[PDB]
């Protein structure tokens, strides 16, 4: 509906850093 992608850590849904989407 309102789409984002974000560079983050401990996030969707992984132990590490990287690029997280939708």
């Amino acid at each position: 509906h309102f789409p984002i992608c974000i560079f983050c850590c401990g996030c969707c849904h992984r132990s590490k850093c990287g690029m997280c989407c939708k």
Partner: antibody, heavy 122, light 111 residues
Framework: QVQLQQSGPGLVKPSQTLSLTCAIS??????????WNWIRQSPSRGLEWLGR?????????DYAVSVQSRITINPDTSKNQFSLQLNSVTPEDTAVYYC????????????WGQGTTVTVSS | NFMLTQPHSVSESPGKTVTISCTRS????????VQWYQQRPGSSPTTVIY?????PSGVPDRFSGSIDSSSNSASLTISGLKTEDEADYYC?????????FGGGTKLTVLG
């Protein structure tokens, strides 16, 4: 199996625009689980990631800082392809250019295209 | 603005186990995923390990990735070396601002 077919001029004069296309088959350019990347390789600069395009309810494109001011990566859903342009080329842009499928999160490449040599020379 | 550093070449007899390391200049090796790419001469690269140790469909189980958050270095290990494994291998990662490849390692399988 995913296939990536590369196409475009192999010689480009300095100051002109390099322009390549990668035609995808066996997978979707709008695929919800893929990213579509451009990577170049020279002896002396080695492997260099250029940028990437992907659809997550919306097209997103990431780009290497070194080339962001001269680069365009565009999808085409009507042809199931993505392109690469690089403006204002210099002989430092001579390289083999690969298109590749990869993983959004981990900046990973999945499936590599066969590559195209582009030479910049007047 | 980090770098990833690998030995220029590494060589080992067929049947044996070999490791190729990749040291990260700055940033934590463990915080970002590490890919390994194989490239035979005159061919496009092929992914052999992704997300630190995931092995893509078709890659022999002789190939494995590992991480050493201590020495700040990823590693690609190949066991029971066969002459087909002779290639350049590149590690690759990222941080928040850039994607980085290692400089590559020529693996020779001593014949």
């Amino acid at each position: 199996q995913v296939q990536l077919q590369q196409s475009g001029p192999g010689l480009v004069k300095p100051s002109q625009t390099l322009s390549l296309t990668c035609a995808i088959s066996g997978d979707s350019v709008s695929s919800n689980s893929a990213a579509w990347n451009w990577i170049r390789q020279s002896p002396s600069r080695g492997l260099e990631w250029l940028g990437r395009t992907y659809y997550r309810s919306k097209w997103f494109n990431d780009y290497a800082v070194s080339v962001q001011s001269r680069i365009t990566i565009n999808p085409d859903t009507s042809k199931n392809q993505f392109s690469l342009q690089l403006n204002s080329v210099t002989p430092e842009d001579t390289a083999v250019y690969y298109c590749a499928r990869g993983i959004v999160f981990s900046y990973a490449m999945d499936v590599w295209g066969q590559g195209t040599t582009v030479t910049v020379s007047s | 603005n980090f770098m990833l550093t690998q030995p220029h070449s590494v060589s080992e007899s067929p049947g044996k186990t070999v490791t190729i390391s990749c040291t990260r200049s700055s940033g934590s090796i463990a915080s970002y995923y590490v890919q390994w790419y194989q490239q035979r001469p005159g061919s496009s690269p092929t992914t052999v390990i992704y997300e630190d140790s995931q092995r893509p469909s078709g890659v022999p189980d002789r190939f494995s990735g590992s991480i050493d958050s201590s020495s700040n270095s990823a590693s690609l290990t190949i066991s029971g070396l066969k002459t087909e494994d002779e290639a350049d291998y590149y590690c690759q990662s990222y941080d928040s601002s850039n994607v980085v490849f290692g400089g590559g390692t020529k693996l020779t399988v001593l014949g």
